[PDB]
PDB file of all heavy atoms in Angstrom:
ATOM      1  N   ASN B 293      68.559 142.933  85.653  1.00  0.00           N
ATOM      2  CA  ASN B 293      67.288 143.428  86.142  1.00  0.00           C
ATOM      3  C   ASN B 293      66.551 142.535  87.146  1.00  0.00           C
ATOM      4  O   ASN B 293      65.658 143.014  87.840  1.00  0.00           O
ATOM      5  CB  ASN B 293      66.350 143.666  84.965  1.00  0.00           C
ATOM      6  CG  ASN B 293      66.810 144.800  84.068  1.00  0.00           C
ATOM      7  OD1 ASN B 293      67.387 145.783  84.541  1.00  0.00           O
ATOM      8  ND2 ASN B 293      66.566 144.664  82.770  1.00  0.00           N
ATOM      9  N   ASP B 294      66.868 141.247  87.177  1.00  0.00           N
ATOM     10  CA  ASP B 294      66.039 140.258  87.867  1.00  0.00           C
ATOM     11  C   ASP B 294      66.663 139.680  89.147  1.00  0.00           C
ATOM     12  O   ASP B 294      65.946 139.283  90.072  1.00  0.00           O
ATOM     13  CB  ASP B 294      65.748 139.109  86.913  1.00  0.00           C
ATOM     14  CG  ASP B 294      65.058 139.575  85.654  1.00  0.00           C
ATOM     15  OD1 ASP B 294      64.074 140.330  85.792  1.00  0.00           O
ATOM     16  OD2 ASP B 294      65.507 139.198  84.551  1.00  0.00           O
ATOM     17  N   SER B 295      67.988 139.590  89.179  1.00  0.00           N
ATOM     18  CA  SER B 295      68.688 138.799  90.211  1.00  0.00           C
ATOM     19  C   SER B 295      69.927 139.508  90.742  1.00  0.00           C
ATOM     20  O   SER B 295      70.656 140.177  90.013  1.00  0.00           O
ATOM     21  CB  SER B 295      69.111 137.420  89.670  1.00  0.00           C
ATOM     22  OG  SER B 295      68.029 136.628  89.220  1.00  0.00           O
ATOM     23  N   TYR B 296      70.153 139.317  92.027  1.00  0.00           N
ATOM     24  CA  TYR B 296      71.412 139.655  92.694  1.00  0.00           C
ATOM     25  C   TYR B 296      72.347 138.474  92.572  1.00  0.00           C
ATOM     26  O   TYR B 296      71.903 137.330  92.661  1.00  0.00           O
ATOM     27  CB  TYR B 296      71.203 139.966  94.183  1.00  0.00           C
ATOM     28  CG  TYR B 296      70.415 141.206  94.477  1.00  0.00           C
ATOM     29  CD1 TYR B 296      69.152 141.144  95.060  1.00  0.00           C
ATOM     30  CD2 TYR B 296      70.954 142.452  94.233  1.00  0.00           C
ATOM     31  CE1 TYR B 296      68.454 142.294  95.346  1.00  0.00           C
ATOM     32  CE2 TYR B 296      70.255 143.605  94.504  1.00  0.00           C
ATOM     33  CZ  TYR B 296      69.002 143.526  95.052  1.00  0.00           C
ATOM     34  OH  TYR B 296      68.329 144.695  95.318  1.00  0.00           O
ATOM     35  N   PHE B 297      73.634 138.765  92.411  1.00  0.00           N
ATOM     36  CA  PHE B 297      74.692 137.751  92.347  1.00  0.00           C
ATOM     37  C   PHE B 297      75.728 138.099  93.415  1.00  0.00           C
ATOM     38  O   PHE B 297      76.323 139.180  93.376  1.00  0.00           O
ATOM     39  CB  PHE B 297      75.347 137.712  90.969  1.00  0.00           C
ATOM     40  CG  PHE B 297      74.382 137.461  89.850  1.00  0.00           C
ATOM     41  CD1 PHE B 297      73.751 138.517  89.225  1.00  0.00           C
ATOM     42  CD2 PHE B 297      74.083 136.168  89.435  1.00  0.00           C
ATOM     43  CE1 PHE B 297      72.858 138.303  88.210  1.00  0.00           C
ATOM     44  CE2 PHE B 297      73.197 135.949  88.403  1.00  0.00           C
ATOM     45  CZ  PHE B 297      72.589 137.020  87.786  1.00  0.00           C
ATOM     46  N   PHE B 298      75.893 137.191  94.376  1.00  0.00           N
ATOM     47  CA  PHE B 298      76.855 137.357  95.462  1.00  0.00           C
ATOM     48  C   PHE B 298      77.863 136.236  95.347  1.00  0.00           C
ATOM     49  O   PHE B 298      77.494 135.064  95.312  1.00  0.00           O
ATOM     50  CB  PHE B 298      76.173 137.318  96.815  1.00  0.00           C
ATOM     51  CG  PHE B 298      75.138 138.368  96.999  1.00  0.00           C
ATOM     52  CD1 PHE B 298      73.800 138.060  96.851  1.00  0.00           C
ATOM     53  CD2 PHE B 298      75.504 139.667  97.288  1.00  0.00           C
ATOM     54  CE1 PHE B 298      72.844 139.046  97.014  1.00  0.00           C
ATOM     55  CE2 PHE B 298      74.560 140.664  97.468  1.00  0.00           C
ATOM     56  CZ  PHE B 298      73.230 140.364  97.327  1.00  0.00           C
ATOM     57  N   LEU B 299      79.149 136.595  95.297  1.00  0.00           N
ATOM     58  CA  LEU B 299      80.183 135.597  95.133  1.00  0.00           C
ATOM     59  C   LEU B 299      81.271 135.776  96.188  1.00  0.00           C
ATOM     60  O   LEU B 299      81.567 136.901  96.608  1.00  0.00           O
ATOM     61  CB  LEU B 299      80.809 135.709  93.730  1.00  0.00           C
ATOM     62  CG  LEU B 299      80.071 135.147  92.518  1.00  0.00           C
ATOM     63  CD1 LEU B 299      78.920 136.086  92.063  1.00  0.00           C
ATOM     64  CD2 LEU B 299      81.071 134.920  91.368  1.00  0.00           C
ATOM     65  N   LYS B 300      81.862 134.663  96.607  1.00  0.00           N
ATOM     66  CA  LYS B 300      83.033 134.715  97.480  1.00  0.00           C
ATOM     67  C   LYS B 300      84.037 133.689  96.976  1.00  0.00           C
ATOM     68  O   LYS B 300      83.843 132.493  97.142  1.00  0.00           O
ATOM     69  CB  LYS B 300      82.635 134.447  98.947  1.00  0.00           C
ATOM     70  CG  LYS B 300      83.804 134.336  99.931  1.00  0.00           C
ATOM     71  CD  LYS B 300      84.756 135.534  99.875  1.00  0.00           C
ATOM     72  CE  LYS B 300      84.197 136.753 100.576  1.00  0.00           C
ATOM     73  NZ  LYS B 300      85.189 137.878 100.569  1.00  0.00           N
ATOM     74  N   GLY B 301      85.134 134.169  96.388  1.00  0.00           N
ATOM     75  CA  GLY B 301      86.185 133.282  95.934  1.00  0.00           C
ATOM     76  C   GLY B 301      87.073 133.090  97.145  1.00  0.00           C
ATOM     77  O   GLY B 301      87.571 134.071  97.687  1.00  0.00           O
ATOM     78  N   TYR B 302      87.247 131.854  97.595  1.00  0.00           N
ATOM     79  CA  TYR B 302      87.992 131.616  98.827  1.00  0.00           C
ATOM     80  C   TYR B 302      89.118 130.606  98.660  1.00  0.00           C
ATOM     81  O   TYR B 302      89.864 130.349  99.600  1.00  0.00           O
ATOM     82  CB  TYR B 302      87.041 131.157  99.933  1.00  0.00           C
ATOM     83  CG  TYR B 302      86.351 129.864  99.664  1.00  0.00           C
ATOM     84  CD1 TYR B 302      86.819 128.686 100.226  1.00  0.00           C
ATOM     85  CD2 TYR B 302      85.209 129.811  98.873  1.00  0.00           C
ATOM     86  CE1 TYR B 302      86.171 127.483 100.002  1.00  0.00           C
ATOM     87  CE2 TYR B 302      84.554 128.618  98.643  1.00  0.00           C
ATOM     88  CZ  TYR B 302      85.037 127.462  99.200  1.00  0.00           C
ATOM     89  OH  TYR B 302      84.406 126.262  98.989  1.00  0.00           O
ATOM     90  N   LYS B 303      89.279 130.074  97.454  1.00  0.00           N
ATOM     91  CA  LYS B 303      90.366 129.139  97.182  1.00  0.00           C
ATOM     92  C   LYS B 303      90.761 129.269  95.723  1.00  0.00           C
ATOM     93  O   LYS B 303      89.907 129.256  94.853  1.00  0.00           O
ATOM     94  CB  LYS B 303      89.940 127.714  97.490  1.00  0.00           C
ATOM     95  CG  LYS B 303      91.037 126.687  97.338  1.00  0.00           C
ATOM     96  CD  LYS B 303      90.498 125.250  97.469  1.00  0.00           C
ATOM     97  CE  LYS B 303      89.941 124.937  98.861  1.00  0.00           C
ATOM     98  NZ  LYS B 303      90.965 124.908  99.904  1.00  0.00           N
ATOM     99  N   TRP B 304      92.050 129.417  95.444  1.00  0.00           N
ATOM    100  CA  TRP B 304      92.479 129.447  94.041  1.00  0.00           C
ATOM    101  C   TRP B 304      93.902 128.944  93.929  1.00  0.00           C
ATOM    102  O   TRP B 304      94.664 129.041  94.875  1.00  0.00           O
ATOM    103  CB  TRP B 304      92.376 130.865  93.467  1.00  0.00           C
ATOM    104  CG  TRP B 304      93.068 131.919  94.265  1.00  0.00           C
ATOM    105  CD1 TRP B 304      94.351 132.339  94.111  1.00  0.00           C
ATOM    106  CD2 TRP B 304      92.518 132.697  95.344  1.00  0.00           C
ATOM    107  NE1 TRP B 304      94.643 133.321  95.024  1.00  0.00           N
ATOM    108  CE2 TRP B 304      93.537 133.561  95.795  1.00  0.00           C
ATOM    109  CE3 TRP B 304      91.271 132.738  95.977  1.00  0.00           C
ATOM    110  CZ2 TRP B 304      93.347 134.468  96.845  1.00  0.00           C
ATOM    111  CZ3 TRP B 304      91.075 133.657  97.017  1.00  0.00           C
ATOM    112  CH2 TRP B 304      92.116 134.500  97.440  1.00  0.00           C
ATOM    113  N   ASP B 305      94.254 128.391  92.784  1.00  0.00           N
ATOM    114  CA  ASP B 305      95.638 127.960  92.544  1.00  0.00           C
ATOM    115  C   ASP B 305      96.159 126.959  93.561  1.00  0.00           C
ATOM    116  O   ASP B 305      97.376 126.872  93.776  1.00  0.00           O
ATOM    117  CB  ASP B 305      96.586 129.175  92.522  1.00  0.00           C
ATOM    118  CG  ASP B 305      96.333 130.105  91.334  1.00  0.00           C
ATOM    119  OD1 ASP B 305      95.748 129.636  90.321  1.00  0.00           O
ATOM    120  OD2 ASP B 305      96.670 131.306  91.436  1.00  0.00           O
ATOM    121  N   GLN B 306      95.276 126.187  94.176  1.00  0.00           N
ATOM    122  CA  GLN B 306      95.725 125.282  95.220  1.00  0.00           C
ATOM    123  C   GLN B 306      96.036 123.905  94.639  1.00  0.00           C
ATOM    124  O   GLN B 306      95.158 123.193  94.188  1.00  0.00           O
ATOM    125  CB  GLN B 306      94.690 125.151  96.344  1.00  0.00           C
ATOM    126  CG  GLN B 306      95.178 124.231  97.439  1.00  0.00           C
ATOM    127  CD  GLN B 306      94.171 124.073  98.536  1.00  0.00           C
ATOM    128  OE1 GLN B 306      93.080 123.576  98.304  1.00  0.00           O
ATOM    129  NE2 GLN B 306      94.522 124.509  99.737  1.00  0.00           N
ATOM    130  N   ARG B 307      97.318 123.548  94.641  1.00  0.00           N
ATOM    131  CA  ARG B 307      97.747 122.227  94.203  1.00  0.00           C
ATOM    132  C   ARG B 307      97.277 121.142  95.163  1.00  0.00           C
ATOM    133  O   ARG B 307      97.406 121.308  96.369  1.00  0.00           O
ATOM    134  CB  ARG B 307      99.262 122.193  94.102  1.00  0.00           C
ATOM    135  CG  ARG B 307      99.841 120.945  93.438  1.00  0.00           C
ATOM    136  CD  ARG B 307     101.339 121.187  93.176  1.00  0.00           C
ATOM    137  NE  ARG B 307     101.873 120.320  92.127  1.00  0.00           N
ATOM    138  CZ  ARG B 307     102.524 119.186  92.353  1.00  0.00           C
ATOM    139  NH1 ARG B 307     102.734 118.778  93.598  1.00  0.00           N
ATOM    140  NH2 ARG B 307     102.973 118.468  91.331  1.00  0.00           N
ATOM    141  N   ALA B 308      96.778 120.039  94.617  1.00  0.00           N
ATOM    142  CA  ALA B 308      96.245 118.951  95.408  1.00  0.00           C
ATOM    143  C   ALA B 308      96.464 117.634  94.708  1.00  0.00           C
ATOM    144  O   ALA B 308      96.446 117.568  93.475  1.00  0.00           O
ATOM    145  CB  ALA B 308      94.757 119.170  95.678  1.00  0.00           C
ATOM    146  N   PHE B 309      96.728 116.605  95.515  1.00  0.00           N
ATOM    147  CA  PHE B 309      96.690 115.212  95.092  1.00  0.00           C
ATOM    148  C   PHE B 309      95.443 114.513  95.621  1.00  0.00           C
ATOM    149  O   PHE B 309      95.234 113.343  95.322  1.00  0.00           O
ATOM    150  CB  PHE B 309      97.909 114.452  95.604  1.00  0.00           C
ATOM    151  CG  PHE B 309      99.223 114.982  95.090  1.00  0.00           C
ATOM    152  CD1 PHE B 309      99.840 116.070  95.690  1.00  0.00           C
ATOM    153  CD2 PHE B 309      99.851 114.368  94.014  1.00  0.00           C
ATOM    154  CE1 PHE B 309     101.069 116.536  95.222  1.00  0.00           C
ATOM    155  CE2 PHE B 309     101.053 114.835  93.545  1.00  0.00           C
ATOM    156  CZ  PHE B 309     101.666 115.915  94.151  1.00  0.00           C
ATOM    157  N   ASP B 310      94.633 115.212  96.420  1.00  0.00           N
ATOM    158  CA  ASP B 310      93.565 114.560  97.191  1.00  0.00           C
ATOM    159  C   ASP B 310      92.724 113.620  96.309  1.00  0.00           C
ATOM    160  O   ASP B 310      92.198 114.050  95.289  1.00  0.00           O
ATOM    161  CB  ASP B 310      92.652 115.618  97.861  1.00  0.00           C
ATOM    162  CG  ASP B 310      93.364 116.394  98.995  1.00  0.00           C
ATOM    163  OD1 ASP B 310      94.345 117.127  98.715  1.00  0.00           O
ATOM    164  OD2 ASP B 310      92.927 116.287 100.173  1.00  0.00           O
ATOM    165  N   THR B 311      92.638 112.333  96.685  1.00  0.00           N
ATOM    166  CA  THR B 311      91.660 111.408  96.084  1.00  0.00           C
ATOM    167  C   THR B 311      90.322 112.131  96.015  1.00  0.00           C
ATOM    168  O   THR B 311      89.824 112.624  97.019  1.00  0.00           O
ATOM    169  CB  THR B 311      91.518 110.072  96.896  1.00  0.00           C
ATOM    170  OG1 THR B 311      92.729 109.320  96.806  1.00  0.00           O
ATOM    171  CG2 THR B 311      90.356 109.218  96.353  1.00  0.00           C
ATOM    172  N   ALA B 312      89.748 112.237  94.826  1.00  0.00           N
ATOM    173  CA  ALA B 312      88.533 113.019  94.682  1.00  0.00           C
ATOM    174  C   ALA B 312      87.771 112.687  93.431  1.00  0.00           C
ATOM    175  O   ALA B 312      88.308 112.221  92.424  1.00  0.00           O
ATOM    176  CB  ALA B 312      88.848 114.519  94.708  1.00  0.00           C
ATOM    177  N   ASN B 313      86.490 112.971  93.518  1.00  0.00           N
ATOM    178  CA  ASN B 313      85.592 112.920  92.390  1.00  0.00           C
ATOM    179  C   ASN B 313      85.617 114.291  91.706  1.00  0.00           C
ATOM    180  O   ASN B 313      85.111 115.267  92.253  1.00  0.00           O
ATOM    181  CB  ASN B 313      84.190 112.560  92.882  1.00  0.00           C
ATOM    182  CG  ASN B 313      84.221 111.718  94.152  1.00  0.00           C
ATOM    183  OD1 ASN B 313      84.309 110.494  94.092  1.00  0.00           O
ATOM    184  ND2 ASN B 313      84.168 112.377  95.308  1.00  0.00           N
ATOM    185  N   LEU B 314      86.213 114.360  90.522  1.00  0.00           N
ATOM    186  CA  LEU B 314      86.475 115.639  89.895  1.00  0.00           C
ATOM    187  C   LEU B 314      85.399 116.119  88.950  1.00  0.00           C
ATOM    188  O   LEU B 314      85.537 117.198  88.418  1.00  0.00           O
ATOM    189  CB  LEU B 314      87.765 115.593  89.101  1.00  0.00           C
ATOM    190  CG  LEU B 314      88.990 115.227  89.940  1.00  0.00           C
ATOM    191  CD1 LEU B 314      90.209 115.315  89.046  1.00  0.00           C
ATOM    192  CD2 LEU B 314      89.161 116.118  91.190  1.00  0.00           C
ATOM    193  N   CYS B 315      84.381 115.307  88.702  1.00  0.00           N
ATOM    194  CA  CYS B 315      83.246 115.751  87.909  1.00  0.00           C
ATOM    195  C   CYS B 315      81.985 114.986  88.296  1.00  0.00           C
ATOM    196  O   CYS B 315      81.438 114.216  87.514  1.00  0.00           O
ATOM    197  CB  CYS B 315      83.517 115.600  86.414  1.00  0.00           C
ATOM    198  SG  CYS B 315      82.204 116.453  85.427  1.00  0.00           S
ATOM    199  N   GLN B 316      81.513 115.207  89.516  1.00  0.00           N
ATOM    200  CA  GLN B 316      80.291 114.525  89.944  1.00  0.00           C
ATOM    201  C   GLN B 316      79.105 114.928  89.074  1.00  0.00           C
ATOM    202  O   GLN B 316      79.022 116.059  88.592  1.00  0.00           O
ATOM    203  CB  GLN B 316      79.992 114.812  91.402  1.00  0.00           C
ATOM    204  CG  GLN B 316      80.933 114.087  92.342  1.00  0.00           C
ATOM    205  CD  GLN B 316      80.489 114.185  93.779  1.00  0.00           C
ATOM    206  OE1 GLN B 316      80.701 115.197  94.450  1.00  0.00           O
ATOM    207  NE2 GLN B 316      79.844 113.136  94.254  1.00  0.00           N
ATOM    208  N   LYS B 317      78.205 113.970  88.889  1.00  0.00           N
ATOM    209  CA  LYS B 317      77.113 114.094  87.932  1.00  0.00           C
ATOM    210  C   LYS B 317      75.932 114.781  88.575  1.00  0.00           C
ATOM    211  O   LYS B 317      75.785 114.733  89.792  1.00  0.00           O
ATOM    212  CB  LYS B 317      76.697 112.729  87.419  1.00  0.00           C
ATOM    213  CG  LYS B 317      77.766 112.025  86.621  1.00  0.00           C
ATOM    214  CD  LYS B 317      77.329 110.621  86.233  1.00  0.00           C
ATOM    215  CE  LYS B 317      78.468 109.870  85.565  1.00  0.00           C
ATOM    216  NZ  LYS B 317      78.940 110.545  84.327  1.00  0.00           N
ATOM    217  N   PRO B 318      75.110 115.456  87.750  1.00  0.00           N
ATOM    218  CA  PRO B 318      73.883 116.047  88.284  1.00  0.00           C
ATOM    219  C   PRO B 318      73.108 115.052  89.089  1.00  0.00           C
ATOM    220  O   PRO B 318      72.972 113.895  88.678  1.00  0.00           O
ATOM    221  CB  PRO B 318      73.122 116.473  87.032  1.00  0.00           C
ATOM    222  CG  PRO B 318      74.179 116.831  86.063  1.00  0.00           C
ATOM    223  CD  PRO B 318      75.343 115.855  86.351  1.00  0.00           C
ATOM    224  N   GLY B 319      72.644 115.484  90.255  1.00  0.00           N
ATOM    225  CA  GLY B 319      71.943 114.595  91.164  1.00  0.00           C
ATOM    226  C   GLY B 319      72.814 113.967  92.240  1.00  0.00           C
ATOM    227  O   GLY B 319      72.315 113.493  93.277  1.00  0.00           O
ATOM    228  N   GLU B 320      74.124 113.931  92.009  1.00  0.00           N
ATOM    229  CA  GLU B 320      75.002 113.386  93.033  1.00  0.00           C
ATOM    230  C   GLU B 320      75.113 114.397  94.166  1.00  0.00           C
ATOM    231  O   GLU B 320      74.982 115.599  93.954  1.00  0.00           O
ATOM    232  CB  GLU B 320      76.404 113.058  92.493  1.00  0.00           C
ATOM    233  CG  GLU B 320      76.568 111.707  91.816  1.00  0.00           C
ATOM    234  CD  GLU B 320      78.057 111.360  91.545  1.00  0.00           C
ATOM    235  OE1 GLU B 320      78.747 110.835  92.470  1.00  0.00           O
ATOM    236  OE2 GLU B 320      78.538 111.615  90.407  1.00  0.00           O
ATOM    237  N   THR B 321      75.377 113.911  95.372  1.00  0.00           N
ATOM    238  CA  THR B 321      75.472 114.798  96.528  1.00  0.00           C
ATOM    239  C   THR B 321      76.835 114.746  97.188  1.00  0.00           C
ATOM    240  O   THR B 321      77.616 113.814  96.980  1.00  0.00           O
ATOM    241  CB  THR B 321      74.409 114.464  97.608  1.00  0.00           C
ATOM    242  OG1 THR B 321      74.622 113.138  98.111  1.00  0.00           O
ATOM    243  CG2 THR B 321      73.004 114.583  97.046  1.00  0.00           C
ATOM    244  N   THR B 322      77.099 115.783  97.976  1.00  0.00           N
ATOM    245  CA  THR B 322      78.259 115.847  98.853  1.00  0.00           C
ATOM    246  C   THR B 322      77.889 116.729 100.042  1.00  0.00           C
ATOM    247  O   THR B 322      76.954 117.529  99.962  1.00  0.00           O
ATOM    248  CB  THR B 322      79.521 116.380  98.119  1.00  0.00           C
ATOM    249  OG1 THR B 322      80.695 115.984  98.835  1.00  0.00           O
ATOM    250  CG2 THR B 322      79.528 117.900  97.972  1.00  0.00           C
ATOM    251  N   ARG B 323      78.603 116.568 101.154  1.00  0.00           N
ATOM    252  CA  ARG B 323      78.421 117.457 102.295  1.00  0.00           C
ATOM    253  C   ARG B 323      79.385 118.629 102.192  1.00  0.00           C
ATOM    254  O   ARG B 323      80.605 118.450 102.178  1.00  0.00           O
ATOM    255  CB  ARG B 323      78.627 116.729 103.613  1.00  0.00           C
ATOM    256  CG  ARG B 323      78.527 117.657 104.814  1.00  0.00           C
ATOM    257  CD  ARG B 323      78.449 116.889 106.122  1.00  0.00           C
ATOM    258  NE  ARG B 323      77.232 116.087 106.206  1.00  0.00           N
ATOM    259  CZ  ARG B 323      76.061 116.535 106.648  1.00  0.00           C
ATOM    260  NH1 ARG B 323      75.932 117.795 107.051  1.00  0.00           N
ATOM    261  NH2 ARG B 323      75.013 115.719 106.685  1.00  0.00           N
ATOM    262  N   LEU B 324      78.823 119.829 102.083  1.00  0.00           N
ATOM    263  CA  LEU B 324      79.605 121.052 102.051  1.00  0.00           C
ATOM    264  C   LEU B 324      79.742 121.525 103.481  1.00  0.00           C
ATOM    265  O   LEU B 324      78.748 121.776 104.165  1.00  0.00           O
ATOM    266  CB  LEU B 324      78.947 122.143 101.199  1.00  0.00           C
ATOM    267  CG  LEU B 324      78.699 121.849  99.731  1.00  0.00           C
ATOM    268  CD1 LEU B 324      78.084 123.056  99.040  1.00  0.00           C
ATOM    269  CD2 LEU B 324      79.991 121.458  99.011  1.00  0.00           C
ATOM    270  N   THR B 325      80.980 121.637 103.949  1.00  0.00           N
ATOM    271  CA  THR B 325      81.187 122.036 105.328  1.00  0.00           C
ATOM    272  C   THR B 325      81.516 123.529 105.488  1.00  0.00           C
ATOM    273  O   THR B 325      81.558 124.051 106.605  1.00  0.00           O
ATOM    274  CB  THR B 325      82.336 121.208 105.957  1.00  0.00           C
ATOM    275  OG1 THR B 325      83.446 121.227 105.059  1.00  0.00           O
ATOM    276  CG2 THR B 325      81.897 119.763 106.150  1.00  0.00           C
ATOM    277  N   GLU B 326      81.743 124.213 104.377  1.00  0.00           N
ATOM    278  CA  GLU B 326      82.134 125.609 104.421  1.00  0.00           C
ATOM    279  C   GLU B 326      81.077 126.484 105.071  1.00  0.00           C
ATOM    280  O   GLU B 326      79.887 126.290 104.850  1.00  0.00           O
ATOM    281  CB  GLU B 326      82.402 126.126 103.006  1.00  0.00           C
ATOM    282  CG  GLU B 326      83.691 125.617 102.363  1.00  0.00           C
ATOM    283  CD  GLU B 326      83.528 124.337 101.545  1.00  0.00           C
ATOM    284  OE1 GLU B 326      82.606 123.535 101.812  1.00  0.00           O
ATOM    285  OE2 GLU B 326      84.366 124.116 100.650  1.00  0.00           O
ATOM    286  N   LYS B 327      81.527 127.471 105.835  1.00  0.00           N
ATOM    287  CA  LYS B 327      80.651 128.501 106.377  1.00  0.00           C
ATOM    288  C   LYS B 327      81.003 129.870 105.804  1.00  0.00           C
ATOM    289  O   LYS B 327      82.179 130.223 105.727  1.00  0.00           O
ATOM    290  CB  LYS B 327      80.775 128.513 107.910  1.00  0.00           C
ATOM    291  CG  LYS B 327      79.974 129.597 108.613  1.00  0.00           C
ATOM    292  CD  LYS B 327      78.471 129.325 108.569  1.00  0.00           C
ATOM    293  CE  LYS B 327      77.698 130.396 109.329  1.00  0.00           C
ATOM    294  NZ  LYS B 327      76.214 130.128 109.368  1.00  0.00           N
ATOM    295  N   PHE B 328      79.974 130.625 105.403  1.00  0.00           N
ATOM    296  CA  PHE B 328      80.129 132.018 104.957  1.00  0.00           C
ATOM    297  C   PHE B 328      79.191 132.957 105.738  1.00  0.00           C
ATOM    298  O   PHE B 328      78.301 132.512 106.459  1.00  0.00           O
ATOM    299  CB  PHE B 328      79.879 132.115 103.449  1.00  0.00           C
ATOM    300  CG  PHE B 328      80.779 131.237 102.652  1.00  0.00           C
ATOM    301  CD1 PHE B 328      80.365 129.984 102.270  1.00  0.00           C
ATOM    302  CD2 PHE B 328      82.059 131.642 102.338  1.00  0.00           C
ATOM    303  CE1 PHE B 328      81.193 129.146 101.565  1.00  0.00           C
ATOM    304  CE2 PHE B 328      82.894 130.803 101.637  1.00  0.00           C
ATOM    305  CZ  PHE B 328      82.442 129.561 101.243  1.00  0.00           C
TER     306      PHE B 328
END
């Protein structure tokens, strides 16, 4: 009743070795480069 939900799934099942932070903590930031 209150909210619209818009979703775009654009990546799935993608195997990666990429050095990464896999659970960044609330308050941590990153630059999102994706465009929709």
Side-chain angles (χ1 to χ4, degrees):
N293 293 326
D294 302 312
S295 300
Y296 293 113
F297 303 89
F298 301 100
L299 282 77
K300 174 53 77 177
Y302 63 99
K303 184 188 295 293
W304 53 91
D305 293 338
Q306 181 181 63
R307 189 169 202 263
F309 299 83
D310 291 64
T311 293
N313 332 273
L314 301 184
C315 191
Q316 287 190 281
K317 295 175 186 300
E320 276 191 84
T321 62
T322 201
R323 176 168 296 274
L324 300 182
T325 48
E326 287 91 334
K327 177 71 178 183
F328 303 95

